[PDB]
Symmetry: C2
Subunit: 759 residues, 2 copies
């Protein structure tokens, strides 16, 4: 009759059992917070205590197998729950040892949504009436606290959207400190006391409606086509009306929790394994790329992998562990035949691995240095449109972007595979020449197939070919039926009775291949020994045969038309199966039938980004021209017309306000940031004033005025060119796209002439 | 007849077997380097190839158990080695399948010294003649390469001392790039080709001498008192004569390798578990403290544990993994009764753990923030003498200091224990009042026991008491015999038949204690249930007894005089066993019989540091006074006496060289660094000149000259005070030490009034 990590309430199971509540803590950290709150003593006389309140741990807890869960068995035992009986009446519910169960879990993705979702699913499966009658409850701790200097009482928000609405109408949010509490352990000692002072206010009840029954069957108890539609749309956050309705009665519908908290957890797991089709990288790889750009921007100096990994964790908010971070960093710099990256983000300094072990023979991160490939990165990922991309915010801090939009589709140009046994994803890189022809035809108006390609977009004609890349592959790519096959190369020495394997299939490691041949009993009866004399980045495997075994091979493998007998005796061919699964930029899962669809879907995103880049540049140039013209006009209208003897902020302001000097916002026009065109327009015009008078005396000289006037002419010439670019026949920024394609191609050619070293 | 990760040489085992060599690679990364070098083809016609050369892996390999090693069995099989036969003659050695075995291991501590030391020990144990006749060899790759711009040929050094001698006489080492190769994976593609172009030059042979036989028995095959003396002295690096003798004949004595490479590996493992008695922290904790000071120096802003852990890895060269780093960071900020740190380095924001689980209930590093305790750290670890401490250099980059010398001995003031099952180390914190009395008496000349204490230092009288700290412990500390015991507190309710435990022993977790009582069958027969209603940082455990079991207890535990029957029925007492094992600052292991010896040994180090601080400050002040006097004298001897129309570096130099302006070194006098007094004297006087003429015109004004003159008087007054401090009766800087002791005490009192929050 014992349960681990369970503290019995004093009144539990007695006459006052219905007044007792069971706190289901997520883990040990949650238990410590509950123990502190439940034992405040005389400091919180009205707060909960160990009277009418108990604790139990939900550690682990991760259908016949469902009943074997030891953690869930303890919850049933302590609550007095009985199977085969439905708690449809109050008198039957009075037999339970506790009045209700309250789940105290973190408000993160690996919190409510997974631990709480399973608890709701477990109760719904066996005792639906308990959820209907409010037996299952949730402790809704504050998510965001805003602290202002001079005030000891913060402003607490239970949802992200609540803070966004409040911050929008809070004018300048400079004197306020914003803290995010995604886990129960994030609360300070004084914050815990405040939460338990109003403990009853943060207890929320779960309600079961008609829509929740279908949702429970989809998310839980089902791993089939039913879940596909739910995960193909993304997470829709709760609206303001829904949030206010929840707080009005402190009742949370089960459907709303599943649609938001549970779905987001499901999508997060997939996003860690499935890349986005816009750039073909997962969120973990984005932080490495975004961190790599930031780390090596000031100086492109060699850094150790573990040293660079610390930079990514410190700056890009990477908290999944250095073991996965260092491995991903190493994979981002590996360059060998059959490597995942045909165009590595980083430059590999040292032994980063080899094709023989499939990159598993990489050196230790302590001795292995890394360096950013500046030439390739600065062209494939332009820095001028990086401000335009949406950015992931981690606890209110800017992190790696939501997605990258490279000049060429990287989801097609690289080899991709997910080691995890779930949501299969395999991508075979298409050759650069085919991809360049398609993109150039789409953008260049003078291309002979420019009109034909645009016609083929709406009808999926696919006039131009897309073929697997044969770079760093001295084999054969043959298309039989609807699948491509990569064939290895072998040499036969009749006099020496030795078969030499000079090439393996496209992505077959040497060590794994030898094991597959060696473990085949039927094939090994013709082989006495296998010797691997292969060099780095080349295959040379000597297969020694029995004295009279070469002849016997041809009558046992039948000499298939598609596969040679030696190519059948030795597994020298493989099928290039593609599982084109990707995550949409807005959220969800998208399925692509062909590599053309991925390229066709990526084109609009890059097309509008060029228009967005020019439109924002046009807005910035107009603001800069106005500011510089006013500064130049100020020199011509200097102390000779209005002196600066006033030397006061208000007093200098009105004297020229009649003249007509605009109160433009400095530090924003000179240095734009991640600000949209609409956001820039309001802040620039309706901002501060102090951009004049703050200049030194030498700027008023005739020589100093000349450079400012010349600067205006330079910006005016640029402004006229931007207008011409916005009016191009195919779409705005078509010529800019073509120029950047050539720059990317030159960087790739330069990186291919060397071993992706560039120096 | 198969061996994993073994590539057979073409001539191995044949007529040319003696010309073949077996390369024993440390791991997969080493194998990749060997494969690249051995297959350079026509690019290296004279280099080694797969002819007369093979590879084998030493992965794992970590006496009856020695013979069961699968990895070593493969080496014996491929070499044709036979037991029970001694290779004392050439004809017997001709039966081996390879001429020699060459170990290709990293030049780091977890390289040669451990993997190579075991290989040498294995051969020495069974076939000593093979080492005598040169069968065992080592591949000595370059350790340090120095690259200078404009030259493609670097300068290679095989030892750290070789580079130090070369860099000492290389004048300004500004145009040279220094790279460290502590592992085989650190070599670039072009460096590997260079190494294998001269492969025979980097092959070194091991020689066995008389002294090596005893050393092999000590380091290997022995875990007893014999190893104690070897590890009590530290590592002595090879001298210049020894290094030159090794390179002259390419023969490495086995004794030299064991005394340097193997001993350093042994000491490194101990240093990761045993702290230094000067500050009571290991090398891992030093990087956290040194990183914490650097991270929070600019702004003391809250940072996540994983975010701060990335900073330590990136800046303090921490490469042992974030799992150990995050755990150590959390332990550095835990503050609860029975915690390891009575004076945590950091301020714990969030749930950092509790006494019930012994700190194991800490929150996830993602949700847990950390903040430096600036008030305590800036006083206990002064920043002005941090430049004086020796510093660990990782690959030529400055890292955390070799040791810290705090104002008070932290090795005595904190609780310490090593979880690892080796080199037992347990420290029980002495109370602050006893420690303050001892240190103050030693430093203050006016203390009544100042003369008595100094007399007691040389005779170990120990006039002043040292007692275990009772802070955050509502129990009893009783000294019986030669050991201290901490007793818990209990309450007995006769009418309720419940025993309430209001206090546990000093360092006994609540959860572990209940398990110990619950697992005792004899004790559990009187207990029906145990309920843990304890609050945070307080103990309240209800023990429910059988109706007639309280009486029976007293006749079964006999009511020992030292231990009460209830204190015996419930394990409410423990022995404060102390294992005072520490690592010496210079290296080695030191054993302390009593806590007085640790305090007595720490005193000289802190005493000389104060003298070193004042002596360097005196030297800096003299240089600053000379520079400022020259600048002031320059204003009085301005263009009126010598103009600056010359405007050339050489031309302006000689015109005032007759006047007598010294060519002082700027950017060093103004901003001292980790430079010794002797180093500072040479560089300051014999440096550059450009400290005059580089000042702006306003500095020559009469008002500007006045502040410079006033600044000289301020420095002159400080210089006179420093001379007075250096002539104090007990020792230089005695009053400075007393002032800093009060500052540390005030910070501790302030941190104890709060819950180590300070705000």
């Amino acid at each position: 009759v014992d349960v681990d990590k369970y503290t019995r309430a004093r009144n539990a199971g007695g006459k006052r059992a219905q007044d007792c509540m069971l706190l289901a803590a997520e883990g040990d950290s949650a238990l410590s917070l509950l123990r502190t709150g439940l034992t405040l003593g005389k400091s919180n006389p009205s707060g909960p205590s160990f009277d009418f309140c108990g604790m139990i741990s939900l550690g682990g807890v991760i259908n016949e197998q469902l009943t074997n869960n030891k953690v869930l068995q303890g919850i049933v035992q302590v609550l007095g729950l009985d199977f085969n009986c439905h708690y449809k009446t109050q008198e039957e519910r009075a037999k339970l040892r506790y009045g209700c169960i309250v789940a105290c879990v973190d408000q993160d993705l690996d919190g409510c949504g997974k631990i709480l979702g399973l608890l709701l699913a477990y109760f719904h499966l066996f005792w639906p009436q308990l959820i209907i009658h409010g037996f299952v409850k949730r402790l809704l701790t504050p998510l965001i606290r805003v602290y202002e200097k001079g005030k000891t009482m913060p402003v607490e928000f239970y949802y992200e959207q609540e803070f966004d609405a409040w911050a929008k109408k809070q004018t300048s949010l400079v004197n306020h400190t914003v803290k995010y509490y995604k886990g129960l352990a994030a609360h300070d000692t004084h914050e815990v006391k405040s939460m338990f002072k109003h403990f009853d206010n943060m207890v929320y009840t779960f309600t079961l409606d008609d829509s929740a029954k279908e949702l429970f069957h989809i998310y839980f108890g089902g791993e089939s086509e039913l879940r596909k539609r739910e995960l193909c749309t993304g997470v829709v956050p709760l609206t303001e009306t829904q949030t206010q309705s929840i707080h009005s009665v402190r009742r949370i519908p089960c459907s709303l929790h599943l649609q938001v908290d549970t779905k987001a957890y499901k999508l997060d797991a997939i996003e860690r394994q499935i890349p986005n089709f816009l750039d073909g990288m997962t969120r973990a790889r984005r932080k490495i790329l975004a961190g790599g750009v930031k780390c090596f921007a000031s100086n492109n100096r060699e850094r150790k992998v573990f040293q660079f990994g610390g930079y990514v964790a410190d700056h890009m908010f990477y908290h999944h562990g250095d073991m996965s971070l260092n491995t991903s960093i190493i994979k981002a710099a590996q360059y060998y035949p059959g490597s995942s990256h045909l165009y590595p983000v980083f430059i590999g300094i040292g032994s980063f691995g080899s094709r023989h072990l499939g990159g598993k023979d990489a050196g230790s991160p302590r001795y292995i240095s890394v360096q950013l490939a500046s030439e390739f990165i600065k062209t494939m990922f332009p820095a001028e449109d990086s401000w335009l991309l949406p950015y992931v915010f981690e606890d209110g801090q800017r992190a790696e972007p939501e997605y990258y939009v490279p000049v060429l589709p990287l989801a097609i140009m690289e080899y991709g595979a997910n080691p995890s046994e779930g949501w299969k994803y395999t991508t075979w890189a298409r050759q650069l020449e085919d991809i360049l022809a398609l993109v150039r035809a789409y953008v260049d108006k003078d291309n002979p197939k420019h009109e034909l390609l645009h016609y083929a977009i709406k009808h999926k004609i696919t006039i131009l070919p897309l073929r697997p890349s044969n770079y760093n592959f001295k084999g054969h790519l043959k298309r039989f039926g609807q699948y491509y096959y990569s064939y290895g190369t072998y040499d036969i020495s009749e006099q020496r009775n030795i078969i030499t394997i000079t090439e393996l299939p496209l992505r077959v490691p040497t060590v794994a291949y030898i094991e597959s041949i060696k473990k085949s009993s039927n094939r090994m009866t013709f082989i006495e020994e296998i010797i691997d004399y292969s060099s780095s980045e080349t295959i040379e495997i000597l297969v020694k045969l029995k004295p009279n075994s070469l002849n016997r091979i041809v009558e046992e493998f039948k000499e298939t038309e598609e596969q040679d007998s030696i190519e059948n005796f030795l597994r020298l061919r493989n099928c290039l199966h593609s599982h084109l699964n990707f995550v949409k930029p807005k959220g969800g899962i998208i399925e692509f039938n062909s590599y053309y669809e991925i390229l066709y879907a990526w084109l609009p995103y890059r097309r509008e980004l060029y228009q967005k880049r020019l439109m924002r540049e046009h807005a910035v140039l107009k603001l800069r021209i106005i500011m510089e013209t006013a500064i130049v006009r100020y020199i011509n209208e200097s102390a000779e017309l209005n002196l600066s003897h006033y030397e006061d902020e208000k007093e200098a302001s009105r004297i020229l306000s009649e003249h007509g000097f605009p109160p433009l916002n400095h530090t924003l026009i000179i240095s734009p940031e991640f600000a949209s065109i609409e956001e820039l327009n309001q802040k620039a015009l309706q901002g501060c004033y102090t951009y004049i008078l703050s200049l030194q005396a030498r700027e008023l000289l005739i020589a100093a005025k000349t450079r400012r006037v010349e600067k205006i002419k330079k910006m005016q010439a640029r402004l006229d060119k931007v207008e011409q670019l916005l009016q191009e026949s195919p779409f705005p920024g078509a010529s800019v796209w073509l120029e950047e394609i050539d720059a990317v191609e030159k960087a790739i050619i330069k990186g291919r002439n060397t071993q992706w070293k560039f120096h």
